[PDB]
Design a protein around this ligand. Sequence first.
Ligand SMILES: Nc1nc2c(ncn2[C@@H]2O[C@H](COP(=O)(O)OP(=O)(O)OP(=O)(O)O)[C@@H](O)[C@H]2O)c(=O)[nH]1
Ligand SMILES: O=C(O)C(=O)CS(=O)(=O)O
Ligand SMILES: [Mn+2]
Ligand SMILES: [Mn+2]
Ligand SMILES: [Mn+2]
Length: 620
Amino acid sequence: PQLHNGLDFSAKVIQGSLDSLPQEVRKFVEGNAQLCQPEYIHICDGSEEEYGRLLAHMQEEGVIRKLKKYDNCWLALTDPRDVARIESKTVIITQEQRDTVPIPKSGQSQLGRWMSEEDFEKAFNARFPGCMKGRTMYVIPFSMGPLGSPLAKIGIELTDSPYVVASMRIMTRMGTSVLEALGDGEFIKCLHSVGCPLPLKKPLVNNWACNPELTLIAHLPDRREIISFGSGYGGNSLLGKKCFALRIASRLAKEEGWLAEHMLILGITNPEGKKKYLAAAFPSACGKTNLAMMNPTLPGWKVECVGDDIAWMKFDAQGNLRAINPENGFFGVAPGTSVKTNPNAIKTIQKNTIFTNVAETSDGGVYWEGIDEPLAPGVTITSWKNKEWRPQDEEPCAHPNSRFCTPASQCPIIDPAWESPEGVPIEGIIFGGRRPAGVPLVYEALSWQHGVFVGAAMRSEATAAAEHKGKVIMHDPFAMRPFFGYNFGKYLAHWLSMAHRPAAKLPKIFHVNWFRKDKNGKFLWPGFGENSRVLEWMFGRIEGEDSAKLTPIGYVPKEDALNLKGLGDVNVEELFGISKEFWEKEVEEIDKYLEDQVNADLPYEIERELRALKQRISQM
Ligand SMILES: Nc1nc2c(ncn2[C@@H]2O[C@H](COP(=O)(O)OP(=O)(O)OP(=O)(O)O)[C@@H](O)[C@H]2O)c(=O)[nH]1
Ligand SMILES: O=C(O)C(=O)CS(=O)(=O)O
Ligand SMILES: [Mn+2]
Ligand SMILES: [Mn+2]
Ligand SMILES: [Mn+2]
C-alpha cells in the first residue's frame, strides 16, 4: 500500500514488469529503488536483442569501443584508479569476529577483514542513499552453475553499470529463464553501484564511472547479501564470481557439506583412451588459465577445459568427489597470452568477447605485452591509457591486470561434460604457486591429512593481481587467502572432515612448482604445454603406478619416471633438489604463520603434520 505515490516504481520500468517478479524479488528491487533513487528500472531478460541494444548504448556513450578486426568484440578502458579487485576494501560482516577470521595470537589477521554490523550500517548509509540518481538500475537474474543442477544457486544483481550487465551475460547464466526457475525460492541478494549519481560532482576519467575514495565490497553471509560500492572492475562488480561463488558460497558449503574453491577443472585423456578429471588451486597470476586450456606437447594426450577459476564440489552417494564449474565464461588475464603460452585462448577470444584495459591496434585489433605476434607495417598502437604508444616507451601498452571476458561455449577444447548438472568426478587435486627456490617441480602428499597441510602451507612470490607488489614470498593457503567466507581454522577442519565420510573416494593431492629458477634467475622448467609431462606422471600415480620415490616432503618421480624426451637439456638434479637448509627455514615460517594466524582454531591434525614434517627434515 501507500498513502501517496513514493513506493510503487512501476512507472519507471523500461523493460519487464514488477508484477511478473516473485514477491521477494519485487521487494528487493523496489526497496533498493526507493533507497538508491534510479531514474529507470530495466529488468534483464538475457536476450540477444537486449544485449545488442546494451552494447549499442555503451558505444554511443563512449563507454566501450568496437574492435572492428574481430566478430562482435569490444574494448573498455577504465579509470586507472579502478583496475583490479581490491583486497584492502573487501570486508565480511558477522556478529562475532571469530566466525569470519580466527583470532590471531599476536598480529593482525591476513585471512580476512571483519567489519561489525554497526560499522557497516554507518558505511552503507554514507554511500548508497541517492547513489543511482539519474541512472538506470538493471536487474540481473543469474544462475551460478547449470540451470537446475543440484549444485546451482541463483542470484539477483542490482547494478547501475551497463558494463556489468554485459559482462554478467558472459560470465553467468542470465535472464528470464532464471526467474522462472527461481519461483519463490531463496536467492543471494547482490547490490552494486559505481557510486556516481548524476549530476557528476567529479569529472569522469576515460568515461569510466567509479568512486575510488568510497570503494567498499561487503559480504553479509547471514543475510545472504553482497553489497558493493564504488568500483566497476572485475571481482568488485561482477558479484557472481568472487563475492558469491567463493566468499558467500564457501560459507554455504561449510553449512551444507560441500566445497567452493579457487580451482580450475580439466579433463585429461591418455593414449590408452582413459580419461581423468583434475582440479588445481593456484593463486591469481600463477597460471590456472594456462593449465586449464593447455595444448599438451606429448602425442596421444588430450586436455579439455571444464572451468579455469572456480569449482564447486560435493561427494555424491557413491563417494565420488563431483565438481561443477559455476561460471559461464572465462575472465582471463590478457597480457602474456600468446600462441605459444595459450593457443586455445587465442582461438576463443576472437568473437563475442569483451576486453578491458588492453591496447588497440589501428586496424581494430588487440595488443598486449607477451602477445608474441608481429604487427604489419603501418599498424600503430593505442595504449590502455588512450595514448599513442611505441615499443620504445617504458609504459606497458596494456595494464598488467587487463582481462578478456569470453563465453566458455566457444572454447575449442571445452569439455563435453562442462554443463552436466551432476558434475565431473575429481581424481586428483593440485596445489602450487610461484617459488623461485627450494621447492621441486612436483611432489605427491603422503595422505589426506598431509595433503590438507600442503594446501595450508602454500606460499607464492608476490605479483600484480591485487594491490601487492614486489618479490616478497607471501602465504596463500589453498589459493584462497583473499576469498575465505569464514574462519580459516574451521575451513581446515571442514577439509579434514571429508576423510570421515562413508565410502569417500579421496583424490590424490599434488603440489607443483612451475617457477623454480637456477642461480642465473632462469626458469629450470619450460612450462606451459610441457606441463603435460607432469600431468602424465600424476595420471600414472592415480592409476597406481610404482613411479614414486619417498622424500621427507612427500613422493617425487623416480629417476627416469618423467617423460623428458625432447627437452634433453633439463637440469633434473636442480629441479628436484631438496635442501635440508631450505626446508628447515620453510617449516619454521609455516609454523610461525599457522601459530599466529590460526592460533586456537588450528586443527590438531594440521599441527601434527607440521611436527611430522619438522621431524623428517631433521633426520636429513
Ligand atoms: N614460467 C611459467 N610461467 C607460467 C606458466 N604458466 C603460466 N605462467 C605465467 O602465469 C601468468 C598468467 O597467469 P594468470 O592468468 O595471470 O593466472 P590465473 O591463475 O589464471 O589467475 P586468475 O584468473 O586471476 O585467478 C603469466 O605470467 C604466465 O607467463 C608456466 O607453466 N611456466
Ligand atoms: O583475482 C583473481 O583471481 C581473478 O580471477 C580476477 S577477479 O575476478 O578477482 O577480478
Ligand atoms: Mn585465470
Ligand atoms: Mn581467480
Ligand atoms: Mn582422521
